[model samples]
Target: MIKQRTLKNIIRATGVGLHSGEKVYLTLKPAPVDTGIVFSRTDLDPVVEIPARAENVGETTMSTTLVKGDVKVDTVEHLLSAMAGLGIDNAYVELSASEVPIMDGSAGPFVFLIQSAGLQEQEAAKKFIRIKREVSVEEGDKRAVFVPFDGFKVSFEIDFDHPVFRGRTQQASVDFSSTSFVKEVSRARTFGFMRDIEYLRSQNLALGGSVENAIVVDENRVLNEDGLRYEDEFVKHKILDAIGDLYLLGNSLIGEFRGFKSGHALNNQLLRTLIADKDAWEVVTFEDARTAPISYMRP
Candidate 1:
């Protein structure tokens, strides 16, 4: 059977928070099997633990945030995306601030950190949330849906009228069974427009955003010196975010996710919708590793 996994060793890093703009120290530690992904704020007098789950999600404006009473963790999508991509099921995220560091504004650095720590397979079988029926949600023109599929897949489409985005590819898709998350998705950075900077700063958001951490665009062009890592980097970043948001379901999903201009909020809603209906999804585990989905199989 495919087994649960955790980090082989503890690892640490330091970076600036995306929204808080504060210096943050992060520590990733191995956890017991089935512990799931948990975030602990060490700055508080008493440690506050926020489990990575859809029910704990609160804000989804520029990033996904996990809230527990008065305590909350912001900008968690990139790190979570890296963990999911690497098939890491259990880990402890220790943070010194309310937000996770926004390294390179993509999941790439987090992927590198997890790889450096390595992964350990435990004796317990890994669980999955298998979609048994189609479930969909809509927010204005935005839409997200999950349908039965043998393996994990994500497809996203975006519509941006800006000059820099006008003629670029606005749609992207990845079937994890044959795709590499590190190479194809993790390097896509979050993007924002210069016109919105003033208002965003007024609201105390995106305080740490910069050309080095994000793909900033003026009215006419991308400000980054290195351009994009992928031809369809914008849409691929959406897919990367969807993967992290969906993983908040507490397990890997065996289904196809389709989105149209969907963001963190829509992705979390889809998971809640699936969870509300008992018949829509079921917890499953493979007794034979060979029979499990190829997307998560060991090499």
Candidate 2:
């Protein structure tokens, strides 16, 4: 059976939150077997531990936010996605602020931080939520679906209806064994529109956003001098965000995810519906060598 994992050593980093503009410090520490992923607010007198699970998700309007009582964490999808991609099962994440720093608007920084700490395997077996039937959610023109598959994969398409993003669609199929997440998805930065920024700022949002952190587009053109990372980076970033939001299910998923024009709200809804239906999935483990949809084990 595949074993659960945690950081080999504690690691720390500090940066500014994207929307909140608050300076934040984060430390990743090892956790015991089956402890699952937990986030703690070190800023509080008595630290509050919030598991990275769906039941604790409190908001999904623009980004994935988790809360327990008044203690909350925001913009957690990138870090969560990196953990899921690396097959990390258990860890303790301590934060000094309400939001995770949006490093380059992608998961690359978190991935690098985790790698720097190294990963250590634990005695307990890792668990996977294997999809048995299709579960879907829709809102207006947006839709997201999770269906049974032998391995984890995601396909997404975005229609921003902007001159820059018009007719731009990209699809990627990721196999845990051969995929290089850092190269394929980690660099796809978050994006926003100029008009939206103005409206958001009027409401005191996007306080930390800039060309250095995100790709900003006006009505007719992208404002960044560097242009696009990938012609279809917009959609790829959506998929990246989806991966992180789905990780809130508390276990790595074994299935295929297909989404179109779907954002955090729809993605979280899909997870909620899937978990609410017992027939949709079950926890399973591999016997000898872990395989696709299970912990990655080499033959």
Candidate 3:
């Protein structure tokens, strides 16, 4: 069978939180089969195991926050996205704070972290959440749809009012079947407007946000001296976020994810709706991983 996989050895890293402004240490440890990418707060009195699942998601204001009782872990999407892109099925994420360090505001760093730890396939069969019917959700101009497909892919669109986003690459489609998520999508950083930073600060949010960890935009142009990593970096990041959001289902998804101006909230809504309709999806497995669809392999 195409077995589940996890880290082969423990890996450690330290970085600053994007929203918390706190320095945190992280440890990625090999986990038993079926662990399902769980997070643990080693700094807490009693470590809490927050399974990375859609039902555990709480707040979705600016990031995907997972909550289990009073214990909450914030901004997990980037790391989760890396895990999904790399086809990691089981692992334990141990961190010292509520948020995963926003390393360069992208999943590429996390990919490096996992790569340093290596990989080992477990005995359990890898699981996939396969869409059986079209399911969708919408709020205002934002909408997301999940449709049946033999492989995983994401099509994202953004209609940001900012002039800096008027470029032809404002929309991007990543058919992972042929594209490489790490080289093509993982390095796209999170972005924010200069005007919103002040207000976000007034609200006591985005405490550690800066050009070093994100793509900061002013009224005229990008504040980052290096310019964009990709012509379609903005929309690519949305696709990155969606990959992380979808992984919350606790398995890789075999479907088409189409979004139009959809953020964290709408993506979660799409999952909730798809799950609510039991007939809309099914759990799948493959005896020969080589038989798996394109995009399932790490390039």
Candidate 4:
């Protein structure tokens, strides 16, 4: 159970890109051991492969984007988050468009996709990036930090002046050793304001966004008739994004993350800052499953 994992078989799906406003196709395929999650743009003549690494991250405007040379893969965090959540270590993500699909504005659909594809354990021991010292990054009042811990955990707090957020939970935490990511974090959909969406629409961004894929809110209330999936969905989704953003390191983490009003930009910065100092972190592996403290162990 303490081995690298990948998909057992190829799986495919289609959906609309959240930013591109175009139909996109995705193919999930298994990769050999040590081959970290890689994404490919299949529409090009010479298909481009972009390794999902923190250094390759280019844009963090609304979502995390992986860039290599002139080509880029947009909105990769949701799928990446799902992969990290499921303890998947190696796989190939083939996409037909620049952006990954905004399936239900959450990682739930991606979780289903990976579950359908099944998981195959490799011979190599699973790799984890263990924090050795405290590392933190800040931008004004926003902050992201990583601290040495035996198991993975995430704590986040957010503040929004909007009315819809006033009565809801603004802080949340997930201890991966006990929390079910699929049941809690993965189901929390991304949310946006109606005004922001309209502005993005005018800017030719978030063109595929709708109430169907995102939790849309007006000035006073949520626009969705079905309501929220969780009472603390906003902060939970932030945790989800942070998990995905942190996965850009290309390995499961053995540490605790604390974020306050942090988003993609600060998350990427935190990774870069941590990696810049070699003494702050170390790579580790467990030969015995019982010795590992991670929650998502393959049975």
Candidate 5:
């Protein structure tokens, strides 16, 4: 059976925060077994430690924000998504800023840095939260659902309705065992609508977003000189975001995720619903040789 993993050595990187527009430094360090994933804000006077879990989620307007007491961190989805995509169970992230570096608005850079540091199999067995019943959350026209499944799978349907990104639907099921996140999803950059940028800037948001860090779409066309990474890059990035938000469960999830025009808010609510009903899921360690790696079962 696969075991829990943490980084073998510390790795460091520097970049600009996607929304904060401030330079940031981040280091990933190995953690003891069962430590789960914790974020340490070195910028804080007392160096606050915030466990990366759904209960810590504080805001979900344009990006996911986590807060502890008065301290806060924003735009953490890409890094968290990379960790989840790689099946990393334990880690200590130290950041010298209030937000994570956007890194081209995707998890590719983070994944590369972690892989370069090397993965270590920890002594503790890996634990997964397996869904036992269907759980769902909805907000207006958006919805997200998690249902019983043997492995992790995400299917996203994004109906932008705008002239640039209309009628796009993409589904991807990754069996963690053989999936190469770097190739499949890591490079899918975040995107933004041009019309929203002006309003976001007025409200002190999207300060760091640009064509370089995200795909910028106007009413009728894309602003980037280069075209889309994939025909369905928009929806793929949504799946990437969903994966990262789902990781707030504090463990790998074994289920099928279906999302329809859902964002961080609906994703977080779905997790809350799943946890509220104990019968919906259970945390267990699988060690049987006959069992499949949770990644492969997703369709």
Candidate 6:
């Protein structure tokens, strides 16, 4: 109900990429109103632009990757989550490498970057994807669904059988209707099992992974020196990823999103299903900021 937003000034960051293991440099800049979040591969011979939309999604294994023609960028969920949490509508993400840098394995770094650049509201009114009815996507036990709600909310559950997760944090729910995104979920780090990470590395993947950026759990306990950011960090991180994947809609949503053992792939499918059924969702904007829903508040 407020308006569109972009960075107030140009900002930059550099870090190691999770897949490429290359020195990734990023430049965040303001974009015109209604531009949405667009990524430019500056390292490519011919620069390529990939808009953050579900239709442009290429790979969903481990992370969200976007492709435009032959150009592709990997591990983008963290940055996209940061943008969505902060209500960023339009921004230019320039990358000098094939993947986004996995800063701290969480959206915290991106949140800091965007806050450093400052937030600038634009002239255009903000858009919302309002759901009309329940639309769900399923693949065996993993599923994601969108239900009509007055404000944005996410309910997520993860089914990892590891002993570390059998504790108290199996399922977590956040209703943006009242909670704050930054404090509630932004800093929850991505996690991996030590055994699985070893195998994944043997396959020449997760190349940039390290204990410094992620929570590495073994069969019995977490390997990190400083443990858990939140009691429900495991599920909270899943919700964080879901928030990022759903943000691919390129607009704020006015609905409830719930997932059971859902990851990037299923999250994308839910969006695709929502769009395919035009009657199930509608776009709306508010003229009076006071009447706008609580989901639009900046975290």
Model 3 misplaced stretches (Cα beyond 4 Å): 295-299
Identify the superior model by lDDT, candidate 4 or candidate 6: 4
Could you estimate the TM-score for every candidate? 0.98, 0.94, 0.97, 0.98, 0.94, 0.97
Candidate 4 stretches with Cα past 4 Å from truth are 297-299
Residue 99 lDDT, candidate 5, scale 0-100: 91
Clash pairs for candidate 3 = none
lDDT of each: 0.91, 0.84, 0.89, 0.92, 0.85, 0.88
lDDT of 3 by residue, 1-299 (tens): 66788988998989888888889999998889887999999999888999999999999989999999999889999999999999999889999998899989999889987887688988888888999999989888788999888998899989987789875487888888789898999999999988888798887568899999999999989999999999899999999999999999999998999999999999998889988899999999987766677534542
Best by lDDT: 4
* Count of clashing residue pairs in every prediction: 0, 0, 0, 0, 3, 0
What's the lDDT for residue 181 in model 6? 86
Residue-by-residue lDDT tens digits, candidate 5, 1-299: 66888988999999888888899999999999999999999988888999999999999998889999878889889999999887788999999998988988889989889888788987777898999999988888888999887767787887766877655544445544456667888889999988888789887788999998999998889899988888878888998999999999999888889998899989999989998999999987778536755531121
Root-mean-square deviation of each candidate, in angstroms? 1.1, 1.9, 1.3, 1.0, 2.6, 1.3
lDDT of each residue in 220-265, candidate 6, tens digit only? 9989988989989889999889989999998988999998999999
- Ranking of predictions according to lDDT: 4, 1, 3, 6, 5, 2
TM-score for candidate 3:
0.97
lDDT of 4 by residue, 52-81 (tens): 999889988888999988899999999999
Pick the winner on lDDT between candidates 3 and 4. 4
Clashing pairs in 2: none
Worst 10 residues of 4 by lDDT: 290-299
Model 6 Cα shift for residue 231 (angstroms)? 1.3
Report the poorest 10 consecutive residues by lDDT, candidate 6: 290-299
